[PDB]
Structures are given as structure tokens and as C-alpha cells.
């Protein structure tokens with residue numbers, strides 16, 4: 205029970221590989237407690253199909269590269285007997301450590317593995333590493349990955365705004381930028397960090413937490429174009445009533461109803477892969493939770509998820525705390541309404557106090573020939589052992 | 597005839613303000629030849645309506661900020677008697693220098709002003725400063741602004757690709773990224789800089805120069821998803837036959853015809869406003885053409901547009917040259933087909949040799965509280981003089 209198994213889960217992030225780096229590098233700093241670090245090819249599917257990547261065959265440099273490369277270096281999946289097969293392949297490979305890096309579902313399943321492992325007489329210390337661009341995990345200040353998209357959305361909103369503002373007298377006067385966020389508006393909220401007073405961008409932020417009042421929307425925008433000269437709205441894909449992609453939908457609304465020239469963009473995967481403008485504090489934290497999960501497992505702790513704790517709002521200070529996987533599931537983290545302005549289309553000062561520090565600092569990745577440098581892993585498989593196995 | 601008039605024209609750029617900086621700073625370095633530098637509020641419309649911005653009231657710092665702030669700091673317009681009114685307001689304000697910073701149309705009109713100025717007995721040296729995200733101006737290696745979008749598109753394609761690649765076995769296997777470029781494919785071509793061999797992203801680049809062969813497209817993508825696991829296409833809004841926004845259109849094509857899970861994004865204004873990942877050589881050149889236009893005017897030269905000349909492909913070397921405005925119009929610059937692969941969906945080595953150096957180096961702007969710092973100008977108007985004036 206000396207090797208460790210690391211796997212990613214759910215949608216990838218611009219810094220989820222930073223976590224992988226934090227976990228892998230510290231594991232290598234304890235050869236007397238942990239042997240090889242195996243990575244699940246394409247997530248737990250990898251463990252299930254017994255496709256284990258031997259990350260020990262990877263040079264220190266490559267591993268170091270992980271902190272400035274987006275996506276999932278080993279691959280991920282959204283996949284949610286199976287538990288029995290996980291322990292069968294873990295013990296066959298001397299795996300006593302299970303580091304599961306993902307959203308809520310992941311944390312829960314990590315816990316269950318822990319339960320079955322004991323039951324079957326095969327303890328395996330399982331520590332989950334937080335990961336969510338939606339920032340909806342509980343018992344943590346922020347979720348690794350969000351800080352970076354927040355910075356991206358805020359920057360993108362600020363830049364597009366300066367553009368529109370430049371020619372709103374002649375050309376387009378309404379710009380809509382559709383961002384991620386189906387049930388949570390944390391991402392859309394980051395857009396408000398672009399402007400700090402009233403009259404400056406973004407004029408409208410569509411939160412999925414606030415039902416869409418077409419009449420209130422159409423009149424706020426119209427009011428903006430003829431007061432400030434233009435209007436930029438940051439709408440999350442989760443715009444709903446009690447849906448609507450969204451960008452073009454609203455654009456059509458303003459056109460047929462206000463006649464203003466519009467423009468829209470849809471960042472999609474761009475926002476969660478923009479490692480070029482990642483948040484330093486975010487990649488810093490992505491690394492830390494990975495290191496702390498390997499440390500908690502060394503200290504002999506069990507079934508925990510590392511956390512980020514805000515030890516100080518003023519001059520923002522943070523550190524890593526702990527949380528019981530057992531309770532991570534069936535809790536979540538909803539965006540507190542007192543974060544949204546009464547207009548329903550704005551962020552409040554309490555929300556700025558929370559976000560602003562999260563996007564602090566820049567962690568530009570190194571650049572080679574004009575482009576960002578990326579990992580480049582061997583990702584070689586270990587020699588099978590079991591006798592095959594199908595999934596659902 | 598000692599003050600100068602600067603104006604922007606057409607769509608703004610991430611570095612068009614860098615040009616404005618290059619022109620303004622050098623003008624201030626010759627108080628014995630040039631007086632105050634006036635800026636046209638919202639382009640020549642400003643001169644027409646006699647709304648002149650006194651940029652002399654701006655601090656050196658603010659002016660310096662111009663090189664790291666996107667959009668048009670003084671505003672721009674797409675506007676194309678009027679010539680007579682331009683000279684009437686120029687001479688009323690002692691303007692002997694006219695620095696017009698825009699695309700082809702701008703250059704031509706700059707020239708005509710020069711012609712009328714003489715005819716009317718009011719010489720005004722007019723030097724045009726190149727500006728085009730479409731990179732279709734003639735007599736110049738590259739057009740200021742393009743290098744930056746190119747870098748943005750290439751980076752964005754590389755980042756989104758790493759994402760898709762991470763989960764193409766379980767989730768989405770076809771990603772489409774719609775970029776700017778209606779009649780030219782220079783922007784779309786920049787996407788190819790993300791991958792250098794065959795099999796790596798972008799697998800398909802839709803150029804407006806190549807007619808869209810649906811069957812050839814659908815089979816190239818399908819061939820890619822089941823050969824490399826996924827397929828990313830960078831399509832310019834100018835995808836046509838002999839149109840189709842485009843992103844969702846093609847997405848629908850692959851869905852109904854290949855059944856693959858897709859994803860798309862539409863960068864829109866984001867690509868031309870992304871000063872955060874601008875190209876150093878690009879902002880370097882944007883400044884230089886601005887400085888060189890003020891220099892050519894000091895040397896007493898007339899009716900010229902500064903240019904960028906590639907004095908060396910190998911270890912890329914460039915400098916500023918000159919071009920007769922008189923001929924800039926009614927020429928243009930088409931993308932040479934031997935730059936596009938025979939597949940019709942790729943960039944060729946000759947195209948890489950041309951582009952790669954253009955996106956070289958990073959010019960990250962300074963950052964304040966998590967976001968990029970921006971100009972902040974007074975942009976005060978000079979006291980009217982004429983007796984009003986309407987436009988068309």
C-alpha cells in the first residue's frame with residue numbers, strides 16, 4: 205500500500221493541472237512513504253479499465269510544466285462492482301493512496317471508496333482535491349479554477365467595453381457576452397469587477413439566481429444606451445425564468461424591441477482554458493490543495509478534502525484547511541442573494557470584497573515562439589495485470 | 597500651420613492606441629516644429645463637427661498609458677464640402693499636420709485632403725498611419741493590429757484544443773471557433789500556428805478564399821475525430837461558397853451528419869481587444885509607424901503612409917518604409933493561395949514563415965488590482981470657432 209493514484213474528474217480547468225503538479229511534486233518528496241504516482245487515463249475510467257499512467261517516468265521538468273498548462277494532462281471524464289473494481293485494481297498495483305481531484309460528485313465517490321476499502325479489508329487513504337470553475341463546492345473560500353475564469357471574464361469584459369465605448373456613437377451600442385454558469389452566477393458576477401461605479405461596464409449582469417424579467421431588462425439596456433451611449437451585458441448560459449444560445453436571444457430582444465445595433469460573443473471553453481491570464485492566487489491555491497492532500501495522507505489523516513480558508517478579508521490572507529468528504533456531497537454552495545444588487549442586474553459591494561482578491565496577481569506561463577509553453581508528457585501505461593473489465 | 601490633427605478610423609484595435617502614443621509622444625519631442633496635437637473626437641466626425649480634443653492637456657503618464665490600452669482612446673467611426681469643411685476647421689485652428697490612422701479608405705481620404713489643401717492655397721502635410729486587423733493593406737509587411745489578433749487566435753486555439761483533447765473520449769469531440777475575417781483569411785490562418793504537424797490542432801481552417809465544400813468538410817472532420825479522437829475547426833465569419841453565425845451552422849452540419857457532440861465559441865470583439873496577450877512585435881510596430889509619420893512630416897515629406905518592411909525573414913528583422921497614399925487605395929492585399937494547403941483546410945509552410953514572427957514576444961500591460969491598467973484621459977475640447985456644421 206505504497207503507490208498512489210491520482211485522477212481528474214469533471215470539466216477540466218486552466219489550473220487543474222497545477223493541482224496535479226502540487227500533488228505529484230510533493231509525493232516525489234517522500235520516497236520513503238509513497239512510491240510511484242499513477243494517473244488514471246481519462247479519469248477513473250482509467251482505473252476501471254486498468255489504464256494506469258506511470259507518472260514516475262516523467263522528468264521533473266515536464267511535471268513542473270503542469271502548473272502553466274491548461275486542461276487535464278492525463279485526461280478526464282464525466283463518468284459517475286465499479287467501486288469493487290476500483291479496489292481490485294488499486295491493491296493489484298499496491299495503491300494505498302487515492303487522490304481524487306474534482307467537483308462534488310468526485311468528493312463523494314472518493315469517500316465511498318474509502319468506506320468499501322475498509323469493509324473489504326483494504327484500507328486506502330482517500331483525500332479529495334477541490335476543483336470547480338462553478339465555485340459551488342462547500343466548506344471552502346473559493347474553488348480552484350474559478351479565480352482564473354473570473355479574471356478572464358473581468359478582463360474580457362473590460363477590454364470589449366473599451367472597444368464598444370470607442371464607437372458607440374456611430375456603430376454598435378449593445379454588446380452581449382455569454383459566459384459559463386448554469387445554476388450558479390459566480391462566473392457572471394466576476395464580470396462586474398470590470399466597472400466599479402454606476403454607468404460604467406458591465407451595465408447588466410444576468411444571474412441564473414435572478415429570474416429574467418424581459419421588460420426590466422429591455423428598459424435597463426435602453427436606458428443605458430441613451431445615458432452612457434452604449435450598454436454591455438454579461439449573461440450566463442443559465443439565464444432562466446421560473447432558459448434563454450443566450451447571447452443571440454437577447455440580442456434579438458434588444459433589436460426587435462429597441463432597434464439598437466448589437467454584437468455578441470460566446471467564450472465557451474475559452475474562459476476555462478485561458479491559462480494565459482490565469483489568476484496567480486488561483487494557480488497558487490490550485491497547487492497548495494494538491495500539496496496539502498498529499499500531506500494530510502502522509503500525516504495518516506483520512507477521507508478529507510483540502511480547503512482554502514480566508515484568514516483575512518482585508519489584505520486578503522489564506523491557507524489550507526480540511527473538510528470531511530462525507531459531508532461535501534449533499535451540500536453545495538449557493539451564491540448569497542445579498543451579493544446581487546436590488547436592480548437584479550448588478551454585483552454588490554459585499555460581492556466585490558469576496559471576489560477581487562481571488563483574481564489578484566498574474567501568473568503568465570512561459571512563452572515559446574509566440575505561444576504559451578505546454579507540458580508534453582510521455583503518459584506511458586503500466587503493464588496490465590487483471591483480466592479486462594467492461595463499464596456501464 | 598503648426599498644430600497637428602490626429603484621428604482614428606474604422607474598427608479599433610488592441611494596439612491602435614499604441615500608434616496614437618507613437619505619434620503623440622514624438623510630436624511633443626519637437627515643440628519648435630509642432631504645437632498642440634489635437635485629436636478628432638470619434639474620428640474625422642470630430643473635425644467635421646469641430647469637436648477637437650486638446651491632447652496637450654494630457655499628462656505624459658496618461659499618454660504613456662496609451663500603449664497598453666485597447667480600443668480608440670479618442671473614439672473612432674466608420675464614416676466615409678466635407679473635404680472643404682475639414683480644411684476650414686484645420687486652418688481655423690492652425691493645423692498644418694494631418695495624421696490619419698486607419699485602413700485603406702482612410703489613407704485615400706488623407707491623400708485627397710492633401711490635394712484640396714493645395715488647391716485651396718492651404719497646404720497641410722498629411723501622413724497616414726496604417727491600421728488593420730484584417731491585414732489587407734498594401735505596400736507593407738503586416739498591418740498594425742493583426743499581429744496581436746493572430747497571437748490571440750493562435751493562443752485561444754491552442755488552449756481550447758488542449759481542453760477538448762482532455763475529454764474527447766467521453767464528452768465533446770468537435771470544437772468550432774469562429775473568428776473575424778470577412779473577405780480575407782489572414783486571421784483564420786493565424787489559428788494554424790497552434791499546431792505544427794498533421795493530426796494536431798487546428799485540423800480544419802475555413803478560409804474565405806476557399807469555397808466551402810460541405811462534403812469535403814464533413815468528411816475531414818469525421819476522419820479526424822476517429823483518427824485523433826477529436827477535431828477543432830477555426831472558421832472565419834467569411835466562410836462562403838461562390839455565406840455560412842457560422843459557428844453554429846457548421847456545428848449543426850456535423851451533428852445531423854456525423855452525430856458527434858460539438859461545442860463552439862464566437863470571440864467577436866474579444867479578439868481585437870485582447871491587449872492582455874498582444875504581440876510585442878505588433879505593439880512595437882504600432883508605435884513605430886506613429887513615430888515615423890510624425891518624422892516624415894518633420895522632414896517635410898508629403899502624402900505618405902509609413903510601412904513595415906521585412907529586412908530579413910530568417911531571424912525576422914523589420915523597419916519603417918514609405919508608401920504613396922495616392923496608390924494605397926485601389927490596391928489591396930489579398931492572401932496568396934500558395935499559403936493554403938491543397939486540402940484547402942490548412943496553412944502551408946510559406947504561411948508559417950510569414951506569420952510566426954509577427955506574433956513574437958509578449959507585451960503584457962501593467963496590471964492594477966487584478967485587471968489591466970487603462971489610459972484615463974481628460975479628452976477636453978478646445979473652444980469652438982466656426983458656426984456649426986451638419987453631416988450626411
Ligand code: NA
Pocket residue numbers: 213214215307
Ligand atoms: Na463538473
Ligand code: NA
Pocket residue numbers: 605606607699
Ligand atoms: Na475598417
